[PDB]
């Protein structure tokens, strides 16, 4: 029955649970964390506890904080450090993420992902768009030939961009981290008056390392069409396969 | 969640061991005398030494009471280490006419001169005022 | 240097509320954890951070309440309803990487005796509260004298000798007993 956790192990397990609730990881390693919490923190670690910690870190933030995501009330050596760093290294051991605390721009960017639109059925659009040309409204593409690097700026986070045989690093205004799992890119979600997801993320790819030679992004592109009266909710949806391979000409 | 429930002279430099129910790394701070299961506190004589691992520890050597503590939940057993000679020594030591009495009813520190103990038992009981009496290593019978 | 001074001994009745204190000096009273430990006539009770703090009561041990005021650097241990089982000594202790080398350090006060009993102050067998002082011939006989510790009886009252007829027998009975709580001086 011995499930004693060391401080680093317990912290990694807490971070794994945080990542799981952020929907960045599908798994967690947390066995023995209830007693670890009740012993090294003094409070219960139920779901509500985690929700409130993530809330008060990313929203309703209060000045200084510690590595366990605890703040010092409002006004101003274990957890009693409360050293507001520029970042927090949420590392569970299985997946790392550099999460940023609240400011004046992260509070402006918090949207409430609580519903979802109906997009458009499927406009007769092409599936073999390249990188240079896009013309999408949800997608912006930057190519730094000086670094052999590609930034894929997305403007519509609800529209997914599944990766395949790819190794990317997405930088958000809430948390920067790298993704290698093929499929939908996973973004953090705080439940605070609803589920809150970041307003935009950026997908950087290093074309140097041949790691993303076979990298294919299947995504959805948005372009206005014809209007029966006004372009009132003019149609704008068609699937597309974007290739990153270093194919000349 | 169980904790340390399994543990363990005439100027004899001795040693007290201890165990536990689960692994506890190397703390068992002994009392302040020794922490980190071996480290000596500033102001403690060097004749006290600590050793061992989570399953069992040892403390090797002022005759008084001692024992250890865990640094997780639960923490702290007590052993008493003073005994010399042969009022009486060592420490380990009612018949009314109607069997042993329903009316069952019911020691000093080691004397600093002869290293002996003094014990007293009191039998509290009216209507009797029956008619008729109150074992040690030094006694053959 | 660092010093911990506890509140005086408390004699209360069952059902009465009680609050004992521990004041620290020679240190900030904000970084080194401070805890209470019970010893019935050692059982770890609780710990809290000295500055802004929650509380770490021992499992199952938590009905008492431990608190602290950092404005006066004073920790408190309180009972809402005392039981006879709470009669014991209570030690406050300041204490300084994981569990080891951390807050359960036991880096102590003089101890606070708490006696829970419905009995009232009475001189002596059957006296309350402790202590009584017993001498022989006003302190003239010490060789062979053994004064036993008091034993709490079921009635709630405390109760508690020198040794040949060839040893210059003169007196046929002596004892000088003093009970200052009830101001009794008895010569037998
Ligand atoms: C990147 O990868 C993601 C994840 O796979 C992918 O998102 C998925 O896109 C597909 C393709 O459009 C979409 O398709 C449905 O998949 C679900 C299984 O999740 C399945 O139920 C669907 O079958 C039809 O029925 C459902 C229920 O009605 C429809 O919602 C759906 O649109 C399908 O088409 C029609 O169904 C009836 C027909 O009368 C009508 O309601 C209507 O006409 C509708 O058009 C497809 O296989 C996934 O869509 C949603 O499906 C269920 C519906 O219950 C939801 O609960 C899911 O949460 C989901 O939102 C969609 N999401 C997934 C799989 O999670 C992207 O398309 C990929 N990007 C690309 C390809 O660029
Ligand atoms: C955020 O988007 C919404 C528009 O959808 C809007 O404000 C949000 O409204 C929803 C729905 O009322 C709020 O979610 C509620 O939270 C309360 C908390 O007590 C719950 O009781 C609610 O449950 C009931 O409502 C459900 C609504 O779907 C019903 O299904 C049912 O009757 C439930 O009993 C519900 O969960 C949400 O908290 C607000 N969000 C905010 C931020 O106010 C507004 O347009 C958007 N706000 C923005 C952009 O700031």
């Amino acid at each position: 029955m011995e499930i004693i956790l060391t401080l680093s192990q317990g912290l990694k397990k807490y971070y794994g649970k945080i990542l799981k609730l952020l929907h960045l990881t599908l798994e967690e390693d947390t066995e023995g964390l209830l007693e670890w919490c009740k012993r090294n923190l003094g409070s219960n670690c139920d779901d509500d506890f985690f929700q409130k910690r993530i809330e008060e870190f990313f929203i309703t933030g209060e000045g200084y904080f510690n590595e366990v995501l605890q703040f010092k009330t409002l006004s101003t050596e274990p957890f009693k450090s409360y050293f507001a760093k520029g970042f927090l290294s949420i590392d569970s051991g299985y997946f790392s993420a550099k999460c940023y605390p609240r400011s004046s721009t992260s509070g402006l960017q918090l949207i409430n992902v609580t519903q979802h639109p109906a997009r458009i059925a499927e406009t007769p659009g092409p599936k073999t768009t390249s990188l240079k040309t896009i013309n999408c409204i949800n997608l912006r593409a930057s190519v730094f030939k000086e670094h052999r690097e590609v930034e894929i700026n997305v403007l519509l986070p609800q529209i997914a961009v599944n990766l395949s045989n790819c190794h990317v690093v997405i930088n958000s205004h809430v948390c920067d981290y790298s993704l290698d799992t093929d499929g939908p890119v996973r973004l953090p979600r705080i439940y605070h008056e609803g589920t809150f997801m970041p307003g935009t993320y950026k997908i950087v790819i290093d074309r140097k390392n041949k790691l993303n030679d076979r990298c294919t992004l299947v995504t959805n592109c948005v372009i206005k069409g014809r209007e029966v009266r006004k372009g009132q909710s003019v149609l704008r949806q068609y699937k597309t396969e974007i290739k990153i391979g270093k194919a000349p000409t | 969640i169980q904790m340390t429930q399994s543990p363990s002279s005439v100027g004899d430099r001795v040693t007290i061991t201890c165990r536990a129910s689960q692994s506890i790394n190397n703390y068992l701070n002994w009392y302040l005398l020794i922490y980190a299961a071996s480290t000596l506190q500033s102001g403690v004589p060097s004749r006290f030494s600590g050793s061992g691992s989570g399953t069992d520890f040892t403390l090797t050597i002022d005759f008084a009471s001692y024992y250890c503590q865990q640094s997780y939940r639960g923490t702290f057993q007590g052993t008493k280490v003073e005994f010399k000679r042969t009022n009486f020594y060592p420490r380990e030591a009612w018949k009314v006419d109607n069997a042993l009495q329903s009316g069952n009813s019911q020691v000093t520190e080691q004397d600093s001169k002869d290293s002996t103990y003094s014990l007293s038992s009191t039998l509290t009981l009216a209507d009797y005022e029956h008619k008729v009496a109150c074992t040690h290593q030094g006694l053959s019978s | 240097e660092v010093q911990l001074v506890q509140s005086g001994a408390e004699v209360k009745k069952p059902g009465e509320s009680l609050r004992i204190s521990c004041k620290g000096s020679g240190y900030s009273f904000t970084s080194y954890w401070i805890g209470w430990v019970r010893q019935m006539p050692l059982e770890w009770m609780g710990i809290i951070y000295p500055g802004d703090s929650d509380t770490r009561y021992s499992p199952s041990f938590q009905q008492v309440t431990i608190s602290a005021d950092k404005s006066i650097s004073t920790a408190y241990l309180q009972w809402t309803s005392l039981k006879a089982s709470d009669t014991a000594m209570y030690y406050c202790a300041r204490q300084l990487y994981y569990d080891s080398g951390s807050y359960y350090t036991a880096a102590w006060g003089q101890g606070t005796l708490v006696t829970v009993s419905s009995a009232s102050t009475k001189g002596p067998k059957d006296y309350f509260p402790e202590p009584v002082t017993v001498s022989w011939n006003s302190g003239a006989l010490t060789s062979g004298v053994h004064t036993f510790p008091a034993v709490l009886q079921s009635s709630g009252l405390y109760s508690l000798v020198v040794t040949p007829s060839s040893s210059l027998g003169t007196q046929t009975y002596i004892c000088n007993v003093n009970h200052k709580p009830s101001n009794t001086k008895v010569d037998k």
Side-chain angles (χ1 to χ4, degrees), chain A residues 112 114-115 191-194 196:
Chain A
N112 61 1
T114 173
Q115 258 64 28
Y191 190 75
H192 158 268
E193 314 291 334
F196 283 43

Side-chain angles (χ1 to χ4, degrees), chain C residues 4 22 32-37 44-49 56 66 75 91-95 103-104 108:
Chain C
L4 268 58
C22 175
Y32 297 142
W33 297 263
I34 301 165
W36 297 89
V37 172
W44 190 83
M45 301 173 78
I47 197 181
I48 85 165
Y49 324 127
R56 217 52 47 91
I66 303 168
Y91 291 103
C92 73
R94 189 206 74 167
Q95 42 204 19
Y103 63 119
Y104 288 163
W108 295 65

Side-chain angles (χ1 to χ4, degrees), chain A residues 82-138:
Chain A
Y82 298 87
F83 296 147
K85 287 176 177 197
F87 60 92
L88 198 35
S89 194
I90 299 296
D91 181 70
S92 80
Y94 323 98
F95 185 81
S96 50
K98 194 194 211 48
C99 270
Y100 299 94
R102 92 294 170 276
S103 296
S104 61
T105 67
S106 59
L108 263 294
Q109 274 311 3
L110 53 84
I111 321 303
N112 61 1
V113 162
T114 173
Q115 258 64 28
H116 50 87
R119 64 172 221 275
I120 279 83
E122 181 60 16
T123 73
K127 292 50 185 183
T128 75
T129 297
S130 182
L131 277 170
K132 178 272 159 299
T133 168
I134 38 175
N135 310 336
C136 303
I137 307 304
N138 46 20

Side-chain angles (χ1 to χ4, degrees), chain B residues 4-25:
Chain B
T4 303
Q5 295 137 0
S6 303
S8 69
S9 297
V10 282
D12 310 358
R13 298 210 61 179
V14 286
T15 296
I16 303 180
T17 76
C18 166
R19 276 203 45 89
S21 58
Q22 295 292 0
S23 172
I24 62 179
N25 187 8

